[PDB]
Every structure is written in structure tokens, then in C-alpha cells.
Ligand binder design. Structure first.
Ligand SMILES: C[C@@H]1N[C@H](CNC(=O)[C@H](c2ccccc2)C2CCCC2)[C@@H](O)[C@H](O)[C@@H]1O
Ligand SMILES: C[C@@H]1N[C@H](CNC(=O)[C@H](c2ccccc2)C2CCCC2)[C@@H](O)[C@H](O)[C@@H]1O
Ligand SMILES: C[C@@H]1N[C@H](CNC(=O)[C@H](c2ccccc2)C2CCCC2)[C@@H](O)[C@H](O)[C@@H]1O
Ligand SMILES: C[C@@H]1N[C@H](CNC(=O)[C@H](c2ccccc2)C2CCCC2)[C@@H](O)[C@H](O)[C@@H]1O
Lengths: 442, 442, 442, 442
């Protein structure tokens, strides 16, 4: 039994299932999915913040962008939908006509994800469950259906864990001015006591209807409601000890931390559990402007995953569905690619722990990441070297046997000075898929 | 004029009428009165708290018990009313068909009570007055009548004082999870700001419609609303200086403290004004499972009253009416019994003050309680000794005359050592009713 | 067992000994007693605050007045002691050479007082006990003696209650600027954490060393130390249940309120226990500038006490000794005169309770005050009427026997309308001292 | 880089060295060691708190017991040292004449301990280092030596971790009244700003001078100084990432929880890291009144450690030296015995992790505990069965090979229903020492 207080809540640590699953699927789906439009300006952390809000690569931010008169979105909206076409009007166009929660679940499972977390309410305040605290929800408008619940049922039937995303920190249904600069965030918020209750009542409602595995909050928790989390966290943990929460509440407790695109990405081993998230492209909500030039390629996707996992994190890869519920082909292919690689290399991923170091490199520049499993150490190359002679810089192994992962073949290695030298038979180098994977056993 | 601040509010002390009346009637009446069912497990303070909520002897707690699947109440509810029979449905069955507020008032007056306090809203949130802050009240549902007001009119016309009970601390209309353990109480609460206002607006409303003599709150005051009491207490006291409040608000001010069954019952003279409450049985709300084996007998009732009064308290005895407004015969008889005893011995009760000691005993084990009235000291025996020679242990009187209360007959006494010896003529011992009462005059 | 929190501390109320004693002696004695000088401008409440600090009638305020250059005190100090004579230097002239605490204790007992309260530390920071928290105390300087201690032994020996006075709110040892306007008091205070600690440690030291009957604080408690009082009050009350504290701490608790000269003096019965304090003259500290024209007369003292007492107060009369330890004749006289009247009419004062009303007047304007003791109602005339027929305006006695208090003579009375008429034989009127006192009974 | 705020500090978790060491030595040595006396009333958790402080089994509490006049300690002090012997005087008898920190370090290493934690300052305020914040320390008085310092050099030399104990919650140098009831602890504390500063400055001084591996606070942290810990914890962790703090600060952060004798001792696996602490006898401070009948036996120590360790805890066994610096024979014996068992079975303790369950019992009641190391599961019997056929109640091994840990002998096992049966040849049962230890593998 957890008591409603920070000291006590600290007794709850990231659940084992979370540490072990290493990949999850994020779903930004909503009425913003209908216009499905954003200017693909670039990655968070690379785009200067003075312009960021004016050329927002995040399509879910459509309403905010639309509220900024004369911004690309505003221009696009006027031309395509007209001026007397309010953003809310998209709730009625959002019909999920082609949606089938089971094909989604089926796909995230073939993709190798171990959990799924849909936005139940994003910054625009539209709710994807039949909530009783607002009529701006998917049961009353558009889909005429409890998207959150129906997807929770499919995911779970598919054997995956189910979490929930909630925009606690922002709700444009309670503001009128758009965010034009990052400083605006410190005062352009619901700000009211009424809002702090709404957020509280809404997450409590998600807790009681779906008892999710992850409470994924975004943009901090309304200040007036922060003391409420002591109760909500205790209430939730007492109903679901294996439940978990992220680090976006602005209170003293969290089970795992988060990083988005470049922001907060650790350079080496952070000393805590975390999770990396990004979209397959530059946006989270679907964006019909993104081509594969903006998306990651299965290979980058794989490398991204390995680098995250070697540093102790989980990759929460986002998929951005269309207003009709289908998942754009460019994203489905990248999911399947990654699913394929995980089918071959999963063993050096799921259930692994960090090693003493995350990273290494070969004398010729190929990057190396490590993962552990008791006595086993996985040497994951971010690529497949050409020569049979591999020189790993600044590495010595006290081990004794160094197998070639996929085949199992004992290999020849020698600790030469500050380096490790291994000879990988071209036959083998030729069986690996995106990464050459070795396995030391000490 | 009281100012809205604790230091100032302290200038208000328990009103003289409250100190002097020594007996009041509590009424737990509501929609829980319809099922009128609880398992008579035992008295608060004797029943282990690990089981208490699962076998709740308090019938008003029916909804909480019903929310605990597979608990006696749940089993009983399913069998008797069915699963598709929600607790709220009882608001429509609660018709007070046989209710007559004047017969109630008449009865509490014959019973010797000096004030009356009905639950205006209990933990289930159903309100017994036409409140404007919820439609879950007795004017709109069931009785179709302002129970609170109509009973306030009768009580007052009968010459008694009228107070109000309000579940400030709990409101199941704002929670879904049941209390299974005492620890749950620290987080399973409305918790919202909206709720703190509701409670505030509701007690202010009772203040303006009925200007009650007692603000009897239960289960603490919502934390977010605690600072509001400075205003509400000032507002109330400025409209009714003789009004009063109990000690269940969790703030620095109170006029009298409370104890329930064994909990907080003082062993000797506490140094403050207090009030003891319990039901005639083990429940407050009516319970059709209680037989006289669970109730107190007029004698225990009398002894209970004397012991409370000798220690400076008031006894607030609870009566649990039926859904139709009648008061079960087992309770009416016990009220009348006590009313009868008070008719004979009231003088050594109402208007009395504590003495130097509350308690004493005779050499043969009969317990003695004392009460004062200026120069007069009342020696109230919890029973009627058999022999004409009474030896009171560890007592010496500097008095001079020791009368036999009911008759007035001067008696023979002698301070022998550490004891007091009195000779009570069998004729006299034979006129007393439940207690032998003497009266010293110093 | 009191707990350290306001709700619990509220359980402690004014000790019975305090309510019954009705007169105490205040002693403002310090190094300011040595110059013993002030402009006797008038009574607090009657002198405009725009002038007060510049023409301060309180001689204990000498240091403050002296810091206002060009002030009468400043003129007098330079002419009498020179410019190079720092106020602190008075600690060396303060010798108490002719001091006999037993003589003082006796004088306060003959005077009719039941408790005594000396200034242990006034605003100037000088401590009259061997405190370990500062060297500016009477043990190390001046008297080289613990005045607080020796006086407490002597008061106690005479069988009187001993309380302590402490200036928690001001300590000129922590400031340099004088108080010129009441407004200045809001920022010219010690203000440091250090000071709040000093204050707490010193009052604790006083409780530990002397366990006084009254903790009389003045001028508020340092804001940074207010939370400390929960702990200090619980600590004190647990060592001394019978102890008492006043209402000058600025926190939610106190056992009795206070009034100074005109300030907070009740017009009719307040609903709580209180104490009136003033000097015999206009100062607390000895003022050699006061003559009989600035003092109350024995008649006025008596009239004062009676009025206070009839409104449920205690009179805390101040005496201000000379720097040598002797009590000024003028002051001594008045004390002995009041004592003589208390010797005669004590029984209508000590141990009394307020009646239904405090006041009444005779047809010809003689003010009348009332006190009660059970069934007995004392009728105290502020003076002795000349005629035998007395008409009391707006009184009606439902009693039966009205007697002449001094002799016992039953007297003739008749309820004539909205008045009460009584005949008091001249032989009796001639025996009374300053007050005609009648005793009504039921 | 930790930041000074709870959210960030949460990133720091129990250092890996702590989780792996499984046993440390606590050293309660002070000037209370000189009288070294107490009534060995019983174990915390088993002795009623209404008596505890009056019959305190903790000899370090001598000063507190001594302030309760008419207490066994009081009787013994006056008979043994006289009425005029102030507790502080023990600082001069505390000489550590026969003290050799290297011998101690060695003894704790031979004993099998991995870290040592001496009391740097207990409730009596006496500091065993040359602190600059008080003269009541071991450098200026008694030993005229920095015990903390010399001991830290010596523990480190023996290759053990050194942590520090500090009584932040109590310091009898700041109070005068003894603790008689647990309730008294809520107000008889230093309470001053001054103290909160002293505490912070002293722990800082300890970090600066010795950079300990463990900051072990006791009795809570002064309320006025709690916000200070954000800064002190960030400062400490930034100098010593590998450092650790316990859970007795009363703030939202800690690296491991604690349990004392019966208090907070987990029944099954808690979900966090923790440490059990107790004396070998009933006291922490040396009690010359304890005999073997008051101490654990080597068998019991071993059984204790095993049980703790199987529930993820560390055993923090206390030794209480004599005033002369020598460790009492009885204590030494038990330490060397445990050491001998750790020498044999160390491998089933150090560096282990909890398994799925902590416990199991044999058909005939022998308790069984489990620990794991990767694929290896250690099966520790709290004793050695007499028969060769062993039936473990409610276990089932999906393993394959079960071996006799001491010899390696593979053994015969069969999953018989809800039980596991195994045959352990008597020649093997005869080689075990206090525990039959089996090792299962997969
Ligand atoms: C997963 C994504 N989360 C976004 C919230 N983003 C953040 O909190 C971003 C953030 C994230 C982590 C550290 C600092 C800032 C913002 C980027 C500039 C302002 C702060 C959402 O705005 C976005 O629609 C999507 O839900
Ligand atoms: C007069 C009765 N008051 C009850 C509230 N009870 C309390 O606050 C009880 C209480 C009362 C006094 C001290 C401590 C606790 C609870 C018993 C265990 C949890 C605390 C109500 O729950 C009950 O229905 C009825 O109104
Ligand atoms: C017995 C006397 N008490 C005085 C304290 N007086 C007050 O706090 C007076 C006061 C003001 C309000 C309530 C009660 C008392 C002050 C009149 C000038 C501004 C406030 C002291 O200043 C004085 O030296 C002496 O000790
Ligand atoms: C190792 C020992 N630690 C003791 C501190 N013990 C506690 O705080 C005990 C406690 C209470 C609750 C949780 C953890 C520990 C106390 C039992 C009496 C009331 C609370 C010290 O008092 C004792 O002197 C010694 O240093």
C-alpha cells in the first residue's frame, strides 16, 4: 500500500516489464489528423525556437499554428478549407471510417513493440474516450466510438501492455492566444482551478476505465493541481503496482524519464531509467507533407533503437495515423522493417541491461553499442564492416569466447594493447542484416 | 463581532445552553435507510480495522460496503435487489410515506433531549434539503419534501434547539473506489477544488436557510477548503453567537470535542467541553439486523448518560429511522425509558457542572458518578445497592447533610478513614429507579 | 497531555486560579528606573499617536525617547547625565541597594493581590535574571543578583502566584533607530532568525528556571518564531497545566485577553476572560515627574477594580519601583488603601462570576456594578448614597431577601416598575467604606 | 550532475556497492559507553511504549534515562557516581586508552562486513571528531583524538566502505527535559533555526572531511532545515556519486529504507532496497548488564542475515565498545562466528539478488530462504535436516541440475506435486556448518 506522499511513493520504481520491453508504439491520433498538414522544418533541438512555432514541424500542433495568422498553416487552411472553417469543425470530419483496432495491434506486435500508448487527449482538448467531463470527445463527435477503450482491448488481446498519453499541461480549449515563443508557455495556460480539477478528474477516469500500464503525461501538470498527484499516484499504484508514470508532471516522482528528438538525449549512460520518443518523420501527428526524405530509414530506426537501449532506455516510436484510421504506407513499411530486424536480433535487446560502457568504435569508424544479459555481452555494430579483420578501439575483453551472434560460431579474437581484434568470416558477416552482432561470454 | 481569524474566533466559547442541555438526539436518516441493512459486527474501537470496512456495522455505510464486491452487503444486495439495481435507485424508493416531524419532536422531547441534529447530507451525498447545488436531494427525489426544514420547524416549535450534521469530509458522489482500509481515507476523497466550494456553499446555505444551533461536521473538512472556515465561522457566529461547531473540521477552532463509541472516550475529567455519540445499537443508520442483543438497555443508556455527564460531556444519542419515516419500536422504547428516568432524576443532570472527581465506587463494586450544582453534589450510583449500609471507597465529605435525592430525607453518614459510610433506609433504596441518587450539600 | 498544535492547545483554558484571583501586581522595574523620568502627557487611548513617542508618558520607554534627539527626554538626559552617557551605562547605576523582595511580597499580599508579574526583560533588552543568552543582565551588571529568582521565592513564600513578563516583540539591543510613529513598529523590530531563537530560548529558560504561573508576552512574538509557540506552549502546559499565557503573541491561542489604559477596555461583558492593566500614574516604569495629580486615588482604584471585575476581568495594577529597590510612597499608599478595602469587601470580589449584566445606575446617577457567587448577587455602588431611599434604574429583583453586605441587616425592597427601590438605614450607609455593598439572594 | 531539487535527486539510486555488500558494522560508541549500563528490558517492537523510556534497553540513552529521576538508571548513577556527577562529566572519563582502530577494522573484515558506520554524534550531542562547531567533541575532551577520522583511515585501509551516523533529530545539548513518552518527541527537540544550521554545518563538515559512503541520519531532520537537504544531498552526490543516504530525514528522498529490531521489518519482499539494524544484544551502546541470554547466537545471527538478505536487505549489525576502546568478548565471539560462516557460504550471500520468493519451509518445519545470482538459485535451510529425504513445501523447480553447494555434488530431485523432493546424502549434510545450502541451476 502506497501512502499519498512523495517519500512513500518513492518505494515504487520502474516495473520490471517496462525495463525489459525495450520498444513501444506512441500514437498521435486526433482531429488534427484530418488536415494532416505541417511544414517539415526539422528536428526538435536543431530548429531555432524563435521560428519553431511559426513553422511547426509537429502536425498535431495545427490549431496552435492556425491561431497564428499568416503562418504557413494559416495560409494553407484558408486556401484549402476557408476562413469560416473553425478548427473544431474537424471533430465532425474525424470519422475513422477505415479503422480496425485489431489490425493496428497486430501490426505493432509484428513490429516488435511491447506496449502501446495513444494520445487520449492532446493540446487541442479533444478526447478519444467517452469522457463525462466534456462533450468534445470521440464518442459524441466524429468516430462515434470509444477509440481509447477499443484500442486498449485490441492491444491487450494481442498480448501487449497499454498506456495512456494525456495533455495535462496544455488545453487550447481553455486558451485563445497561440504559443508564438517558448517564453509564452510560462503564462499561456488554462491557469484556472477549474482546469486543475478537470485534468485530475480526467486522468482518474482513465485510471478507473482502463487501469493503463503507463500514465504518460505531457507539458507538466497544472500548478494548482500538483499536490493532487500524491493522491492520484497512490490511488493508481494501489490499484496497479505494475502501473508506471513518466517525468512530465513537474512533481518529485517519476518511474522513468523522457527525451524528445535532440532534447534531453543522453550522451552516455544516464543513471536512471528513460525513454526516447520521436516520430518516424519530424511530426507526431500525421503530416502529408513528409516524404521519405524526412523519415528515418529502417536502418536508422534500428540504429536509433540500439543506441537508446545500450544507454538504458526504451524507444517509444510514434506512428501518425490518418483521419480515417489507416496508417500511412511509409510508416507501416518502416515498422515492418524494424519488426523484421527485432525478429532476428531481439535477443540482444529485450530483457538486456546496460554494460559498463554503452559505446565503442572500430578503428575504421563503425560505431559499436553494447548490451548485457548476465554473463553474455552483446556487441552490436551499427552496420556491417567489409573486412574480416575488425579492430575495436579502446576495448579489452577478459572473456574467452566471442561468438558470432546469429550463427553461434566461436570466433578468433585477441586483445592487442588498448584494442580488441576479432576476425569475422565473410560467410558470417554476410548473414547479418543491418548490424553485425557479436556476443562475448565471460 | 468576530473577525475571520483563528485568534479572534477563539473569543467564542461553547454557548451556555449547550453546556447545560446534557442530552441531544442525532438522526441518521437517508436513502440508506431503505435497505436498512448491515452486519452487526461490533463497537467502533473493539472491531479490528483490517476487517471493519468489510463487515461494517454502520448501515449508513451501505453504499461503501456495496462498492466492495463480495462483502456481506454486496451478497445481500444482489440477492435482494439484484445486480442491475444501483445504490442511487434508493433515492426514488425513499418516500417517508409515514413521516410526521411533530411526532418525532414530541418523542425527543418526552425522551428528555434538549436539541436535535439530523444528517442533512451523509457520505453518500444525498441531501435532505432542497439545496440548489445538486439535484440529488430530498425535494427532487423520494420524499419530495424539505426534510431538514420541516424537522427544524417541528423541533423548534417543541422548544428544542436544532443543529445540523454534514459530511464535509466524504462524498461518494465524487469518488468511485470504496474505503477498504483506514489508510485509504488519506487519499480516497473528492480532493478537488470544485468539492471544497460545494461543501462551503452547502454549509453556508444551511446557515442562511435554518441558522442551526450546531454546525456538526464529519470526517474533517476538505483540505483545500480549510482556510474558508475562518470566514464561515465568523459569518455564522456574527449571525448567531449562540451557534456552535464541533471538532471535526481539522482547523484550530471548535466549541466542543467529540468521541464515538470507544474512540476518544475520556477515562476521567478531560479539561474541555465534549460530546459522546453512539447509536442505540452498533449502527447509526437503521439496521433491520439488530436485535435488542445489540442494543443498549434503558439501564445501560442511563449509566452511559451519567458517566458522560459526570465527565463534562453531553450525550448525543443516535436514532435510526426507517425509509418510511417511522422510528423502529426497539429504539422508541429505549428513548421513552431514558425519558422516564430523566423525568425523575433530571435535576442532578441538566445544568450541572463537573465536580472534583467524576468517579468513585462502593466497597462492594457498584460504580459512582458525581455532578455538581453550586453547593449541591449529586452522588449517582450506577445501580441500586441491596444493603442499607453503603461503604464508598476513597471518599470523605466535609459537607454535613447528605439527603436521599428523590425523597429529600436527611441521611446518616460518617467519614471512616479513607471511606465514607452512609445508611440508606430500604424504604428509600426501594423508591429509586435505575440509580440510587444521594445529594450532599456543603 | 497537550500536543504541539493549535487545535490541541485550544483544550487549555484559563486556569481556575486566575479567574478567581481578581487582582495582580505588575512590576516594571529595570535600568530605566534609575533615570525614572518622563513627560506625564496622558493616558494611552487619549493621547494622539502623532505625538506619543515624542512626549512618551511611559518612563520604561526612556531609551527609545532618548534616541529621538530633541525630545524632552533627550533634553533632560544631556542636562542631567551628559552627552557621553550611553543608555546602557544605567545598568551600572541600577544597584537595588535598598531592595527587599520579602517586603515587596508582603506589601502586594497586604494590598490584596493574588499574583505578581515582574518585567523579566523589557524593550531595552536588559534581563533581570542570570540568563545564559546575554551578558546585559542583572547578575553580571548592576545588582549582581537574580532579581527574577529572588522575587519569585519571596512572592511564593507569601503564598502568591508568580508569573513572568517578557518583551518578545521589541528588544532595542537589536535595533538602532527609534520608534517615532506607530507605523514604524511594522519594520523597526529585530527581524532576524537569530532574535526569534533568542526569544524562544529565553522564555524556555524562564519556564525551566521558574515555571511561572503566567507567561505574559508583550508587543507580539517575532514572526519568524511564531510556529515555535506551538512547541513552547505544549512544553509549558505539560510541565504546568495550571500555567497561563496572554494574548500578545500574535498566534491562534491565549488563555485571557488584555486591555491597556483605554485600549481594548470592554464597555459591557466581553464573552471571554480578560485582564486590565495600567500604572497607578500614567507610566509603568517609575516616573519621578508624576505627582498625585497624575495618579488614581484609592477611591478610583476601587471603582476601577469593581468595574473590571464585573465585566469578568482581572485588574493587573502596575507598580514601578526606584532604581534602588524601594517602592515610592505615593504608590505604596494607594496599594495599602485598596488592600484595606479588599480586606472589607473581598468576599464580593475574589472568587466571583459575572452576573446577567455588569451595570446599573441609581436615579440620581450613582453607578452600580454586579458580581455573583452562586445564588448570591453582590450589588456594589461606586460610592455611598446620602439618602435612605435608593432607586436603582432599570432593575427588578426576583429574589426575596436583599441584605446589607457589611452587617447582614435584611433590608426593605420593592419592585416599582422598571426600577427596584430599597431603603438603607443611615446607620448602615455610615458603616460602608468607599462603596455601599448590598447582597441579594434567592 | 545532480541539481538541488527532489525531482532531480530521485535520479540517484542505491549505489551498486551497497546492494552487493550485504553486511555492515554499526558502532555506537560515545561517552555513554563509560557507564555502559541499562535495564535489558527487551526488543523494540516488543516492549510497550508506556514503559520504554523509563526502562530503556538502549544504553546510549543513558543521559535521557538519567534525567528521569527515579528511573533504574537514575538509581544506578547516584549509587555509582554520585548526585553531583553531571552526565557531561563522562566526556572526561571517555579516554579510549586501549583503542586500536586497526584492530577494529580487521575484526569487522574478518567478521565478513563490507562497510562500517560509527556514531559521529549521538543524541547527547557529543561529537567524535574535531568539529569546529562545538567544544563537546572527542579532540578537546576525553580521547583528545579524532576517533571518526582515525577510524575512517583504518576501515579504508582494510578495504571497507566507511559511512557516518549523525543524530540530526535529537541533541540533548539543546534540551533540558527528558523524553518520557513517544508523544514527547513531537515537541522536545532543539526547534531552533540555530540548531537546523548546526546540523547542516556539521553534516557538511563530515562530507568535507571524510566524504563518507553513507550518510546515515537518525531521528528525523530538523523541520526548519529540511529544505537544506536538497542542497546538501546534491553537494554530497556531486562529490561522491557512489555515496548513499538513508530514510530517516523526513524528506522525499533516500537511497534505502531502514528497519530497527521489530519495527518496519518486512514479512516478504518489499519493493525497494532496505537495511535491518540491531545490537548483538538489546542495546546499541555497550550494556555491561547484557549477558549471553540477551544476545543472538552465531546460529541466530546467520539465520538473521540470511532472512534479511533474501528479502533484499542488508544487515547493519551494531557493536557497542567499552569506554576504553575495546570490543567486549561476547560481541567479538559472535562477530568471528558469523565471519566463519560467511567465509564458507559467502558466495550465496554477497552480490546476490532476490529471487521470485524469499521463503519456503520443509515438510517438517525447517525454514528455507532463497537468493539468486543470474541463473544460479541458492537454497539456504535455516539449519541442517537430519534425514536424507527432504520435502520442500510448495516449491517446484523447472531447473535441471540441483547441487550441494559446499561440495558440488549433483543431487537427485523430483517435483512431487506442489512440492519438491531431494535426497541429500548424509556425508554431505555432515559437511555443512549451520546451514544446509543447495544451489539450483538452469
Ligand atoms: C511527444 C510530443 N510532446 C510535445 C510536448 N513537448 C515538450 O514538452 C517539449 C520538451 C520536451 C522535453 C524537454 C523540453 C521540452 C517542448 C519543445 C519546446 C517546448 C518544450 C507535444 O507538444 C507534441 O505534440 C507531442 O505530444
Ligand atoms: C457519527 C458517525 N460518524 C462517522 C465518521 N467516523 C469517524 O470520523 C471515525 C472517527 C471518529 C473519531 C475519531 C477517529 C475516527 C472513524 C472510525 C474509523 C475511521 C475514522 C460516520 O462514518 C458515520 O456514518 C456516522 O456519521
Ligand atoms: C505594560 C506596558 N505594555 C506596553 C505594550 N503596549 C502595547 O502593545 C500597546 C497596545 C496596543 C494594542 C493592544 C494592546 C496594547 C501599544 C500602544 C502603543 C502602540 C501599541 C509596553 O510598551 C510598555 O513599556 C509596558 O510594558
Ligand atoms: C540505532 C539506534 N537508532 C535509534 C533511533 N530509533 C528510532 O528512531 C526508532 C524508530 C521509529 C520508527 C522508525 C524507525 C526507527 C524509535 C523507537 C522509539 C521511537 C522511535 C536511536 O534512538 C538509538 O540511540 C540508536 O542510535
Amino acid at each position: 500500500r502506497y501512502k499519498p506522499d512523495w517519500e512513500s511513493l518513492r518505494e515504487h520504481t520502474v516495473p520490471k516489464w517496462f525495463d525489459k520491453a525495450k520498444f513501444g508504439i506512441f500514437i498521435h491520433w486526433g482531429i488534427y489528423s484530418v488536415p494532416g498538414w505541417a511544414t517539415p522544418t526539422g528536428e526538435l533541438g536543431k530548429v531555432p525556437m524563435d521560428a519553431w512555432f511559426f513553422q511547426n514541424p509537429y502536425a498535431e500542433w495545427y490549431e496552435n499554428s492556425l491561431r497564428i495568422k499568416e503562418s504557413p498553416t494559416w495560409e494553407y487552411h484558408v486556401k484549402t478549407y476557408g476562413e469560416n472553417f473553425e478548427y473544431e469543425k474537424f471533430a465532425d470530419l474525424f470519422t475513422a471510417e477505415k479503422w480496425d483496432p485489431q489490425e493496428w495491434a497486430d501490426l505493432f506486435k509484428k513490429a516488435g513493440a511491447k506496449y502501446v500508448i495513444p494520445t487520449t487527449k492532446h493540446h487541442d482538448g479533444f478526447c478519444l474516450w467517452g469522457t463525462k467531463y466534456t462533450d468534445f470527445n470521440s464518442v459524441k463527435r466524429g468516430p462515434k466510438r470509444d477509440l481509447v477503450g477499443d484500442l486498449a482491448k485490441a492491444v491487450r488481446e494481442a498480448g501487449l501492455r497499454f498506456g495512456v498519453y494525456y495533455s495535462g499541461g496544455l488545453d487550447w480549449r481553455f486558451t485563445t492566444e497561440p504559443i508564438r515563443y517558448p517564453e509564452d508557455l510560462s503564462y499561456i495556460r488554462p491557469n484556472t482551478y477549474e482546469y486543475a480539477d478537470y485534468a485530475y478528474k480526467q486522468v482518474m477516469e482513465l485510471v478507473d476505465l482502463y487501469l493503463p500500464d503507463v500514465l504518460w503525461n505531457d507539458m507538466g501538470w497544472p500548478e494548482k493541481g500538483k499536490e493532487d498527484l500524491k493522491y492520484l499516484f497512490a490511488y493508481y499504484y494501489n490499484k496497479h503496482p505494475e502501473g508506471s508514470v513518466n517525468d512530465r508532471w513537474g512533481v518529485p516522482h517519476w518511474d522513468f524519464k523522457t527525451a524528445e528528438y535532440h532534447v534531453n538525449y543522453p550522451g552516455d549512460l544516464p543513471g536512471y531509467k528513460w525513454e526516447f520518443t520521436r516520430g518516424i518523420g519530424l511530426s507526431f501527428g500525421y503530416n502529408r507533407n513528409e516524404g521519405p526524405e524526412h523519415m528515418l530509414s529502417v536502418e536508422q530506426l534500428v540504429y536509433t533503437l540500439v543506441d537508446v537501449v545500450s544507454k538504458g532506455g526504451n524507444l517509444l516510436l510514434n506512428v501518425g495515423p490518418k483521419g480515417d484510421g489507416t496508417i500511412p504506407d511509409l510508416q507501416k513499411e518502416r515498422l515492418l522493417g524494424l519488426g523484421e530486424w527485432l525478429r532476428k536480433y531481439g535477443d540482444a535487446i529485450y530483457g538486456t541491461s546496460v554494460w559498463e560502457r554503452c559505446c565503442a568504435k572500430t578503428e575504421d569508424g563503425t560505431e559499436i553499442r553494447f548490451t548485457r544479459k548476465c554473463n553474455r555481452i552483446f556487441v552490436i555494430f551499427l552496420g556491417i564492416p567489409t573486412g574480416e579483420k575488425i579492430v575495436i578501439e579502446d576495448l579489452n575483453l577478459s572473456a574467452g569466447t566471442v561468438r558470432h551472434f546469429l550463427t553461434g560460431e566461436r570466433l578468433s579474437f585477441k586483445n592487442v594493447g588498448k584494442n580488441l581484434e576479432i576476425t569475422v568470416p565473410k560467410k558470417l558477416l554476410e548473414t547479418d542484416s543491418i548490424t553485425l552482432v557479436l556476443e562475448a561470454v565471460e
